Design a protein around this ligand. Sequence first.
Ligand SMILES: [Cl-]
Ligand SMILES: [Zn+2]
Ligand SMILES: [Zn+2]
Length: 111
Amino acid sequence: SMVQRVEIHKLRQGENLILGFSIGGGIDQDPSQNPFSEDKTDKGIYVTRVSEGGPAEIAGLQIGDKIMQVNGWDMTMVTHDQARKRLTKRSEEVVRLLVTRQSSMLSETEV
Ligand SMILES: [Cl-]
Ligand SMILES: [Zn+2]
Ligand SMILES: [Zn+2]
């Protein structure tokens, strides 16, 4: 798996600002119910949906991505609602994420 930096600018949907994805997981949840994890004891926060055409998709977020950090806050052992809260601060227009993603990128040049 690889680490990836993702930056998402929220889109104003009337009065709300939204990122355009859904989360699952958290240390309060039963990790057996998470289909995206490789290890079914992983209680981490996973991207379970990405809204087509939305800010997260355009920013490069992918379904199954594990969210490790949001704006400098570590997300590996947070509750589901703690994750929600960190992602939905009305004050914050931009969310910067570190995610892990399970995986020829070699640039080759003729001379
Ligand atoms: Cl919750
Ligand atoms: Zn698309
Ligand atoms: Zn910006």
